[PDB]
Design a protein around this nucleic acid. Structure first.
Ligand SMILES: C=C[C@]1(C)C[C@@H](OC(=O)CSCCN(CC)CC)[C@]2(C)[C@H](C)CC[C@]3(CCC(=O)[C@H]32)[C@@H](C)[C@@H]1O
Ligand SMILES: [K+]
Ligand SMILES: [K+]
Ligand SMILES: [K+]
Ligand SMILES: [K+]
Ligand SMILES: [K+]
Ligand SMILES: [K+]
Ligand SMILES: [K+]
Ligand SMILES: [K+]
Ligand SMILES: [K+]
Ligand SMILES: [K+]
Ligand SMILES: [K+]
Ligand SMILES: [K+]
Ligand SMILES: [K+]
Ligand SMILES: [K+]
Ligand SMILES: [K+]
Ligand SMILES: [K+]
Ligand SMILES: [K+]
Ligand SMILES: [K+]
Ligand SMILES: [K+]
Ligand SMILES: [K+]
Ligand SMILES: [K+]
Ligand SMILES: [K+]
Ligand SMILES: [Mg+2]
Ligand SMILES: [Mg+2]
Ligand SMILES: [Mg+2]
Ligand SMILES: [Mg+2]
Ligand SMILES: [Mg+2]
Ligand SMILES: [Mg+2]
Ligand SMILES: [Mg+2]
Ligand SMILES: [Mg+2]
Ligand SMILES: [Mg+2]
Ligand SMILES: [Mg+2]
Ligand SMILES: [Mg+2]
Ligand SMILES: [Mg+2]
Ligand SMILES: [Mg+2]
Ligand SMILES: [Mg+2]
Ligand SMILES: [Mg+2]
Ligand SMILES: [Mg+2]
Ligand SMILES: [Mg+2]
Ligand SMILES: [Mg+2]
Ligand SMILES: [Mg+2]
Ligand SMILES: [Mg+2]
Ligand SMILES: [Mg+2]
Ligand SMILES: [Mg+2]
Ligand SMILES: [Mg+2]
Ligand SMILES: [Mg+2]
Ligand SMILES: [Mg+2]
Ligand SMILES: [Mg+2]
Ligand SMILES: [Mg+2]
Ligand SMILES: [Mg+2]
Ligand SMILES: [Mg+2]
Ligand SMILES: [Mg+2]
Ligand SMILES: [Mg+2]
Ligand SMILES: [Mg+2]
Ligand SMILES: [Mg+2]
Ligand SMILES: [Mg+2]
Ligand SMILES: [Mg+2]
Ligand SMILES: [Mg+2]
Ligand SMILES: [Mg+2]
Ligand SMILES: [Mg+2]
Ligand SMILES: [Mg+2]
Ligand SMILES: [Mg+2]
Ligand SMILES: [Mg+2]
Ligand SMILES: [Mg+2]
Ligand SMILES: [Mg+2]
Ligand SMILES: [Mg+2]
Ligand SMILES: [Mg+2]
Ligand SMILES: [Mg+2]
Ligand SMILES: [Mg+2]
Ligand SMILES: [Mg+2]
Ligand SMILES: [Mg+2]
Ligand SMILES: [Mg+2]
Ligand SMILES: [Mg+2]
Ligand SMILES: [Mg+2]
Ligand SMILES: [Mg+2]
Ligand SMILES: [Mg+2]
Ligand SMILES: [Mg+2]
Ligand SMILES: [Mg+2]
Ligand SMILES: [Mg+2]
Ligand SMILES: [Mg+2]
Ligand SMILES: [Mg+2]
Ligand SMILES: [Mg+2]
Ligand SMILES: [Mg+2]
Ligand SMILES: [Mg+2]
Ligand SMILES: [Mg+2]
Ligand SMILES: [Mg+2]
Ligand SMILES: [Mg+2]
Ligand SMILES: [Mg+2]
Ligand SMILES: [Mg+2]
Ligand SMILES: [Mg+2]
Ligand SMILES: [Mg+2]
Lengths: 207, 56, 114, 123, 118
RNA sequence: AGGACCGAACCGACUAAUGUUGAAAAAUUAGCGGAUGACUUGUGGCUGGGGGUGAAAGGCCAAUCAAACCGGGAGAUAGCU
RNA sequence: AGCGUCGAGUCGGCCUGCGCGGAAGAU
RNA sequence: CACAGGUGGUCAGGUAGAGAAUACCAAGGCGCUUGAGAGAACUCGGGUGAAGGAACUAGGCAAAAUGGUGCCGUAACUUC
RNA sequence: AAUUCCUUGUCGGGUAAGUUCCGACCUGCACGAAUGGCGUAAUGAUGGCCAGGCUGUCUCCACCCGAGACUCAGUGAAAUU
RNA sequence: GAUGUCGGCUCAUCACAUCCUGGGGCUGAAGUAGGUCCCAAGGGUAUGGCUGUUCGCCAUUUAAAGUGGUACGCGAGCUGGGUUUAGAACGUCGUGAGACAGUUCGGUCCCUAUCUGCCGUGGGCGCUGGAGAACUGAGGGGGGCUGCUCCUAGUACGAGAGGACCGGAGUGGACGCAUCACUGGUGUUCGGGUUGUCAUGCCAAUGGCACUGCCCGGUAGCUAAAUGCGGAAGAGAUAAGUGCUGAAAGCAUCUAAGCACGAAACUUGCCCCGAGAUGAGUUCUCCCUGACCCUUUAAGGGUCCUGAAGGAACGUUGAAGACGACGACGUUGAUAGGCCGGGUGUGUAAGCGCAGCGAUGCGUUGAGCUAACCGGUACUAAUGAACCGUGAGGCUUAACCU
């Protein structure tokens, strides 16, 4: 399983041998198990967890009853982790960042920053046409988008302008630099998706 | 670029299926003056949330 | 924020000397050549300081063996063993990038006498 | 950060004074050579009696760049100019017998240990 | 993108915006209530409230800074002699915006902005 | 002194971008050439269509030119659509 | 045929029916 | 067309400047008859750019650059 | 060669590399002496070639300021079919 | 009664007769390195000089610089060098007008997208009581490149020269995703210097205008040149190929029965989308437990009472965004602005005093000012309401329970 945390920001760790390690600081507060899914009832094995806190007035009655069944305080959301065969958890159990104490590498999933409507230069690394040499109104435009009468259409998946970012992204195989159970911190080497303050899912590296 | 065929009255109506205006959901009632007003806006007689904020 | 400041504070050197742009500084840096670790001196004019807590840096310019060289030191790096001010310089600007176009007599900085 | 058409100074006594990069070696579409990379050069200016002549095509190792080198703590070393040391086209061994100006620790490898030894300082 | 950026362009260049807010700040200090568009009113708070803050400490230097930013000695005098004193014990929030419907000529959303103790 | 030189007005129109259902049926913007001369400009006059005028491009002769425009022969003729 | 053994068929041409390979192309 | 065009003459302030150039002003005249927001792609008109420096391209097209006054100094060639 | 088809002739120069350029050669497909020959200082918004400087021309684009584009209110076209 | 043309640029997409990388048979294959044929389309597959060139030659790279189809792909996407209007000239032909699949210099590239398609993004209704969430994963998409060095090993092989397979370790190129801690760019919203001029009565101090007047620095954000990460391993079923056992055919035979190996192709594994998957799925939680009248007795129609869960709307807004959407917050409140403290940047304000004939210098003083930053703080604005959404949810059959 993994844990849900929050992107605090980036910093560095200086080692004694004069290496500066760029780190993302992830705040991983206790993940509380809100539901256990099993083959009999659900058709698959998973835990649902919450973390953090929500204000009572923003917790709906359906949400509150779900948390009350588990006997946990309302957190800011719900997330599931699939269980492997040996993994067993109970409802109401708190899972802390000490989970990662002996984990060497993690995959980190977040929502990437939102670039809004992006052109083909930015979105797909298209090359610009001439800035000069007679170019008429066609500096960052996409160029040709197809052939001719055969096939007489544009193919699906054609790279074009559109919404960029603000999507789920996983970065794989990041080194765990430090697990600090006292401060609820996980330090991972390198950048992870999303803005400061965004939710992160951290799992032991699949590869 | 221009149409090769005249679009129908049917297609015109379909495009305009999103053009309908939306009425103000409800008006608020000032606690003092009893005047109807747009919510979070002052009344026509210069009241807001029971206070004469604007004279005339 | 408070979290990062705490992580940064515990790594910060506590005995970094005061220096300013225009000062001549000698920076002693660790050089690891096999098992041998030794101090190498880099002495020159401070042309830029970036004050940014743990991420503070400063740029030292020297003319070395007929060639202009600039080193940007990361102030709190353990590679930097020591910093000493050799001469206090009197300049107006924060950033002395104008010295890159100057050599010899034209590149002299007046001593700051106070 | 040297590319095709970049002019370099010469950090040796080969006789070359100015050389131009005509190829960044060591991969398809490889854009740039930094400190310690081997480039193909043409000699654009040489002193009357040296080991090399204007128009000769040979190799060089880049030893100083304006873009500079990054160290593992995040530090940078930048030079005022781009400079290289001419190498024999086949052997990739220095043509000259003296090295002028500082070089960097990036050259401390088996291939370039001669340059390190001749250099007046290594940064 | 405009991530984390502050300030409204208001379909003007920088010199026009600066001049307009200097004029409008003067108008609000003089009259104590003005009607303008809602976005201009929201921007005006960021110009006027720092002038009032500056005016809490009467010195030659502060009067000159106020004069540099308003270019009106009637406004400077009112800031230092009336408004600074009136707001001495108030920690910001010297103005209030009251939305007041839509302008006839262009349907612009309008608001009154006033000094809070008017 | 000068079909002299640099350069505004003034007269032009080499390049580029824009514009191309234009702001404009030929322009705008940045640059560009001439700028006391074979210069430029106001007012008025004269030359008329196989005719004029042309430092000559078949250029120009009222947004029209390898034969103007208007009216007439005239419902030319059309083995073509 | 395989190893004198050995114990029933065996051998290879012709004619003809139906198949097999020969057989790589672009939305 | 209440149209970025065309249209001869006259008048000629201040500071800086060789100047009727140019900048800022005076007298005087105007803000150009849709506005309000927003701060995507892309287009137009502009500013800045690491390292490189014509590798761009039909072509350095465009851009960047040079730019004043005084003095020193200035080659081939020449119809002097 | 503003002329040369064969042709990117050949040789030399310049470049790492030069169908262009410059200098030669003569094999002038098909120069040539007032429908002038060969030169020629100066001049040219003239054609070709090279170099220094310079740079977003480019490697390879990034950010920013403005006008549109987008949304709201008012007015309200067009080609085509 | 018009189907825009060479070449380039931009953007491609398919075939496989494969250029590289992968697998394999034969070799006149010792090794290294080749030759040739078979399998294989996953991914990858030069920059320049010359020329309008495509091509080609040349220089220098690369694992390689594939061959073709796509209106000789792509001008309602760009260019306009070539070519093919009107000007002009040369050679040539012609008495001449003129002409040339000869040359030469110059020479207008329009279109606001209705439909299809494609990239994005919403609204509607559906999914059978309504609602808030978490999911399953049919299906779809992305990704899939490779060098060099070292070790194995100077081993195997070889007369020597040279010099491996297999397997292991490292470090790169190109490409891609993310990010802003660092290095930097930008930073007309921050600070400063400075030219001309006009103004604020004047001095002093400031402001306007001159491209942000010109400049020097630079916060946040955005960002690449910055720095993290990726391609895989593994599995299944195979290609060419290699076999085991094995008859038909006493032998032989990889094949007929039976069994085993076998590649970047295929199916998975990795990443993303995904129940309009109308075949509309699952799980958890929440909400509603009132009367009566009428007729065309019916999944009928209406009246009174009731109005839930939740939603929407409005407001303050956001590292979300064209608009919609999405997220945060609305006083029981840090949602935005202000304010306070800090940081950062700039670089010692003004005023006063002192020194100097003065420009100016020095002191007060690392001063003053300081955006988008950090930590805080109800001062201002986020309103009591109102609005939508209802009142136990069809029939049949089975099983279980009354
Ligand atoms: C005017 C016709 C053009 C635009 C161009 C035409 O090219 C020619 O006709 C070349 S000969 C005429 C050249 N020029 C006048 C001297 C006019 C373009 C060319 C390339 C073809 C050879 C004939 C067919 C074509 C349509 C498709 C095409 O390739 C075109 C026509 C129908 C097109 O309208
Ligand atoms: K006539
Ligand atoms: K000839
Ligand atoms: K003659
Ligand atoms: K003559
Ligand atoms: K010439
Ligand atoms: K192709
Ligand atoms: K083979
Ligand atoms: K392939
Ligand atoms: K065609
Ligand atoms: K074309
Ligand atoms: K078309
Ligand atoms: K177009
Ligand atoms: K259609
Ligand atoms: K950064
Ligand atoms: K920055
Ligand atoms: K001034
Ligand atoms: K569903
Ligand atoms: K959206
Ligand atoms: K606040
Ligand atoms: K001082
Ligand atoms: K002072
Ligand atoms: K300071
Ligand atoms: Mg965004
Ligand atoms: Mg390009
Ligand atoms: Mg055009
Ligand atoms: Mg353009
Ligand atoms: Mg079809
Ligand atoms: Mg038709
Ligand atoms: Mg509509
Ligand atoms: Mg903000
Ligand atoms: Mg506007
Ligand atoms: Mg200005
Ligand atoms: Mg003259
Ligand atoms: Mg003329
Ligand atoms: Mg002009
Ligand atoms: Mg002249
Ligand atoms: Mg002149
Ligand atoms: Mg003619
Ligand atoms: Mg005419
Ligand atoms: Mg006639
Ligand atoms: Mg008749
Ligand atoms: Mg007729
Ligand atoms: Mg008008
Ligand atoms: Mg007019
Ligand atoms: Mg005139
Ligand atoms: Mg003027
Ligand atoms: Mg813009
Ligand atoms: Mg510029
Ligand atoms: Mg800047
Ligand atoms: Mg640059
Ligand atoms: Mg530079
Ligand atoms: Mg240069
Ligand atoms: Mg070139
Ligand atoms: Mg090229
Ligand atoms: Mg030019
Ligand atoms: Mg310029
Ligand atoms: Mg020829
Ligand atoms: Mg030739
Ligand atoms: Mg060249
Ligand atoms: Mg030659
Ligand atoms: Mg010649
Ligand atoms: Mg002749
Ligand atoms: Mg004769
Ligand atoms: Mg003659
Ligand atoms: Mg002649
Ligand atoms: Mg409208
Ligand atoms: Mg037709
Ligand atoms: Mg094949
Ligand atoms: Mg396939
Ligand atoms: Mg595969
Ligand atoms: Mg080529
Ligand atoms: Mg074609
Ligand atoms: Mg093709
Ligand atoms: Mg076009
Ligand atoms: Mg087309
Ligand atoms: Mg052409
Ligand atoms: Mg002609
Ligand atoms: Mg795919
Ligand atoms: Mg990269
Ligand atoms: Mg930062
Ligand atoms: Mg910087
Ligand atoms: Mg400023
Ligand atoms: Mg003064
Ligand atoms: Mg003024
Ligand atoms: Mg003015
Ligand atoms: Mg057998
Ligand atoms: Mg591979
Ligand atoms: Mg500071
Ligand atoms: Mg000041
Ligand atoms: Mg001091
Ligand atoms: Mg502060």
């Amino acid at each position: 399983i993994g844990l849900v945390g929050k992107k605090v920001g980036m910093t560095r760790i200086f080692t004694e041998d004069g290496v500066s390690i760029p780190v993302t600081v992830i705040e991983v507060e206790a993940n509380r198990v809100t539901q256990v899914k099993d083959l009999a009832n659900d058709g698959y094995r998973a835990i649902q967890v919450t973390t953090g806190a929500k204000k009572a007035n923003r917790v709906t009655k359906p949400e509150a009853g779900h948390f009350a069944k588990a006997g946990v305080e309302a957190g800011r959301g719900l997330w599931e982790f699939r269980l492997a065969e040996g993994e067993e958890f109970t409802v109401g159990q708190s899972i802390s960042v000490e989970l990662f104490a002996d984990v060497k590498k993690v995959d980190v999933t977040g929502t990437s920053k939102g670039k809004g409507f992006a052109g083909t230069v930015k979105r797909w690394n298209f090359r610009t046409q001439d800035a000069t040499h007679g170019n008429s109104l066609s500096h960052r435009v996409p160029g040709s988008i197809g052939q001719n009468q055969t096939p007489g259409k544009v193919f699906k998946g054609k790279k074009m302008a559109g919404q960029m970012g603000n999507e789920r992204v996983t970065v794989q195989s990041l080194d765990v630099v430090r697990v600090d159970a006292e401060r609820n911190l996980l330090l991972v080497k390198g950048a992870v998706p999303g803005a400061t303050g965004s939710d992160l899912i951290v799992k032991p590296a699949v590869k | 670029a221009v149409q090769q065929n005249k679009p129908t009255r049917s297609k015109r109506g379909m495009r305009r299926s999103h053009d309908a205006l939306t009425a103000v959901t409800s008006l608020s009632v000032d606690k003092t003056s009893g005047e109807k007003h747009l919510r979070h806006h002052i009344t026509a007689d210069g009241y807001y949330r029971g206070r004469k904020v604007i004279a005339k | 924020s408070n979290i990062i400041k705490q992580l940064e504070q515990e790594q910060m050197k506590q005995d970094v000397p005061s220096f300013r742009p225009g000062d001549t500084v000698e920076v002693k840096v660790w050089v690891v050549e096999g098992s041998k670790k030794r101090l190498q001196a880099f002495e020159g004019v401070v042309i830029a300081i970036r004050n940014r807590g743990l991420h503070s840096a400063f740029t030292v310019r020297k003319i070395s063996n007929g060639e202009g060289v600039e080193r940007v030191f990361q102030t709190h790096s353990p590679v930097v063993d020591s910093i000493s001010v050799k001469r206090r310089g009197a300049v107006r600007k924060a950033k002395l990038y104008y010295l890159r176009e100057r050599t010899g007599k034209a590149a002299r900085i007046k001593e700051r006498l106070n | 950060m040297i590319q095709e058409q970049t002019m370099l100074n010469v950090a040796d006594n080969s006789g070359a004074r100015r050389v131009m990069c005509i190829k960044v070696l060591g991969g398809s579409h490889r854009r740039y050579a930094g400190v310690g990379d081997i480039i193909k050069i043409t000699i654009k200016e040489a002193i009357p009696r040296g080991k090399v002549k204007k128009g000769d095509v040979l190799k060089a190792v880049v030893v100083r760049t304006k873009k500079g080198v990054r160290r593992p703590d995040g530090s940078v070393i930048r030079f005022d100019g781009n400079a290289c040391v001419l190498l024999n086209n086949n052997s990739e061994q220095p043509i000259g017998t003296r090295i002028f100006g500082p070089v960097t620790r990036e050259l401390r490898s088996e291939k370039f240990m001669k340059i390190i030894s001749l250099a007046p300082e290594v940064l | 993108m405009r991530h984390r950026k502050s300030g409204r362009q208001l379909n003007r260049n920088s010199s026009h915006r600066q001049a307009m807010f200097r004029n409008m700040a003067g108008s609000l200090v003089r009259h104590e209530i003005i009607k303008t568009t809602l976005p201009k009113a929201k921007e005006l708070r960021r110009v006027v409230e720092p002038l009032i803050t500056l005016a809490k400490t009467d010195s030659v230097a502060n009067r000159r800074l106020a004069f540099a930013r308003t270019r009106d000695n009637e406004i400077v005098a009112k800031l230092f002699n009336e408004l600074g004193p009136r707001f001495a014990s108030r920690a910001g929030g010297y103005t209030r915006i009251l939305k007041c419907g839509f302008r006839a000529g262009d349907n612009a959303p309008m608001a009154y902005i006033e000094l809070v103790d008017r």
